[PDB]
Design a protein around this motif. Structure first.
Motif, PDB file in Angstrom:
ATOM      1  N   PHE A 186       4.728 -26.343   4.687  1.00 17.58           N
ATOM      2  CA  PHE A 186       4.456 -27.265   5.726  1.00 17.58           C
ATOM      3  C   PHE A 186       3.616 -28.507   5.472  1.00 17.58           C
ATOM      4  O   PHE A 186       2.437 -27.894   4.718  1.00 17.58           O
ATOM      5  N   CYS A 187       3.685 -29.624   5.880  1.00 17.81           N
ATOM      6  CA  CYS A 187       2.694 -30.896   5.608  1.00 17.81           C
ATOM      7  C   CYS A 187       1.294 -30.301   5.936  1.00 17.81           C
ATOM      8  O   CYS A 187       0.326 -30.303   5.296  1.00 17.81           O
ATOM      9  N   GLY A 188       1.146 -29.697   7.374  1.00 19.15           N
ATOM     10  CA  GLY A 188      -0.197 -29.508   7.759  1.00 19.15           C
ATOM     11  C   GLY A 188      -0.260 -28.735   8.980  1.00 19.15           C
ATOM     12  O   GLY A 188       1.009 -27.925   9.630  1.00 19.15           O
ATOM     13  N   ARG A 189      -1.197 -28.470   9.947  1.00 22.35           N
ATOM     14  CA  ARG A 189      -1.140 -27.951  11.086  1.00 22.35           C
ATOM     15  C   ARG A 189      -1.989 -28.519  12.123  1.00 22.35           C
ATOM     16  O   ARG A 189      -3.027 -29.435  11.818  1.00 22.35           O
ATOM     17  N   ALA A 190      -1.532 -28.778  13.389  1.00 22.93           N
ATOM     18  CA  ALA A 190      -2.284 -29.250  14.514  1.00 22.93           C
ATOM     19  C   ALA A 190      -2.015 -28.504  15.753  1.00 22.93           C
ATOM     20  O   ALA A 190      -1.245 -27.646  15.932  1.00 22.93           O
ATOM     21  N   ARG A 191      -3.381 -28.433  16.535  1.00 23.10           N
ATOM     22  CA  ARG A 191      -3.479 -27.649  17.645  1.00 23.10           C
ATOM     23  C   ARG A 191      -3.277 -28.597  18.948  1.00 23.10           C
ATOM     24  O   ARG A 191      -3.384 -29.679  18.727  1.00 23.10           O
ATOM     25  N   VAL A 192      -2.485 -27.811  19.993  1.00 21.15           N
ATOM     26  CA  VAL A 192      -2.336 -28.384  21.114  1.00 21.15           C
ATOM     27  C   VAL A 192      -3.460 -28.397  22.006  1.00 21.15           C
ATOM     28  O   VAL A 192      -3.830 -27.581  22.526  1.00 21.15           O
ATOM     29  N   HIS A 193      -3.850 -29.792  22.525  1.00 23.75           N
ATOM     30  CA  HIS A 193      -4.910 -29.797  23.239  1.00 23.75           C
ATOM     31  C   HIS A 193      -4.512 -30.222  25.052  1.00 23.75           C
ATOM     32  O   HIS A 193      -5.168 -29.896  25.839  1.00 23.75           O
ATOM     33  N   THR A 194      -3.269 -30.556  24.685  1.00 22.83           N
ATOM     34  CA  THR A 194      -2.827 -30.893  26.196  1.00 22.83           C
ATOM     35  C   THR A 194      -1.620 -30.100  26.598  1.00 22.83           C
ATOM     36  O   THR A 194      -1.001 -29.662  25.509  1.00 22.83           O
ATOM     37  N   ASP A 195      -1.273 -29.807  27.778  1.00 19.46           N
ATOM     38  CA  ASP A 195       0.061 -29.036  28.030  1.00 19.46           C
ATOM     39  C   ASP A 195       1.089 -29.942  28.638  1.00 19.46           C
ATOM     40  O   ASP A 195       0.814 -30.429  29.829  1.00 19.46           O
ATOM     41  N   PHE A 196       2.252 -30.243  27.883  1.00 19.66           N
ATOM     42  CA  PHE A 196       3.225 -31.027  28.324  1.00 19.66           C
ATOM     43  C   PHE A 196       4.436 -30.175  28.389  1.00 19.66           C
ATOM     44  O   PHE A 196       4.858 -29.281  27.858  1.00 19.66           O
ATOM     45  N   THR A 197       5.355 -30.470  29.321  1.00 17.69           N
ATOM     46  CA  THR A 197       6.536 -30.008  29.591  1.00 17.69           C
ATOM     47  C   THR A 197       7.898 -30.894  29.641  1.00 17.69           C
ATOM     48  O   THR A 197       7.691 -31.663  30.672  1.00 17.69           O
ATOM     49  N   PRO A 198       8.650 -31.113  28.782  1.00 12.71           N
ATOM     50  CA  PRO A 198       9.888 -31.864  28.758  1.00 12.71           C
ATOM     51  C   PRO A 198      10.700 -31.519  29.983  1.00 12.71           C
ATOM     52  O   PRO A 198      10.783 -30.622  30.725  1.00 12.71           O
ATOM     53  N   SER A 199      11.698 -32.341  30.115  1.00 15.79           N
ATOM     54  CA  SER A 199      12.945 -32.185  31.172  1.00 15.79           C
ATOM     55  C   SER A 199      13.864 -31.252  30.796  1.00 15.79           C
ATOM     56  O   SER A 199      13.954 -30.649  29.539  1.00 15.79           O
ATOM     57  N   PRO A 200      14.465 -30.492  31.912  1.00 15.01           N
ATOM     58  CA  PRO A 200      15.236 -29.295  31.581  1.00 15.01           C
ATOM     59  C   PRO A 200      16.650 -29.798  30.929  1.00 15.01           C
ATOM     60  O   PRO A 200      17.543 -28.981  30.733  1.00 15.01           O
ATOM     61  N   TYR A 201      16.818 -31.092  30.672  1.00 15.71           N
ATOM     62  CA  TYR A 201      17.821 -31.810  30.054  1.00 15.71           C
ATOM     63  C   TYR A 201      17.478 -31.979  28.577  1.00 15.71           C
ATOM     64  O   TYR A 201      18.493 -32.158  27.627  1.00 15.71           O
ATOM     65  N   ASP A 202      16.442 -32.406  28.265  1.00 16.63           N
ATOM     66  CA  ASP A 202      15.850 -32.956  27.062  1.00 16.63           C
ATOM     67  C   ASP A 202      15.412 -31.407  25.999  1.00 16.63           C
ATOM     68  O   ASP A 202      14.359 -31.035  26.528  1.00 16.63           O
ATOM     69  N   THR A 203      16.247 -31.389  24.870  1.00 24.14           N
ATOM     70  CA  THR A 203      16.001 -30.178  24.292  1.00 24.14           C
ATOM     71  C   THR A 203      15.295 -30.599  23.120  1.00 24.14           C
ATOM     72  O   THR A 203      14.537 -29.758  22.423  1.00 24.14           O
TER      73      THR A 203
END
Length: 73
Positions: free
Chosen positions: A8-25
């Motif tokens: 893997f290129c690298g690693r990143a941590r999630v600081h924000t909580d996002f939620t995609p649409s029920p149609y966007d996979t």
């Protein structure tokens, strides 16, 4: 289980909580406190990382690139 070597290129941590649409996979579910293994990172554009057996697209502004650094103790 993990074979042994990490690819893997690298690693990143999630600081924000996002939620995609029920149609966007394509969009991955970003949650505060979640690691995302980056597979590829182009010069200009979004990045690609795997999370929960699902690799999609996510912005860098949502995560914090962790760079160990040149020098260390």
């Amino acid at each position: 289980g993990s074979s042994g070597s990490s690819g893997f290129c690298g690693r990143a941590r999630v600081h924000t909580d996002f939620t995609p649409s029920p149609y966007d996979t394509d969009s991955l579910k970003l949650k505060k406190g979640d690691i995302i293994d980056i597979i590829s990172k182009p010069p200009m554009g979004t990045w690609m990382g795997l999370l929960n057996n699902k690799v999609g697209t996510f912005k860098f502004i949502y995560v914090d690139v962790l760079s160990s650094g040149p020098s260390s103790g």
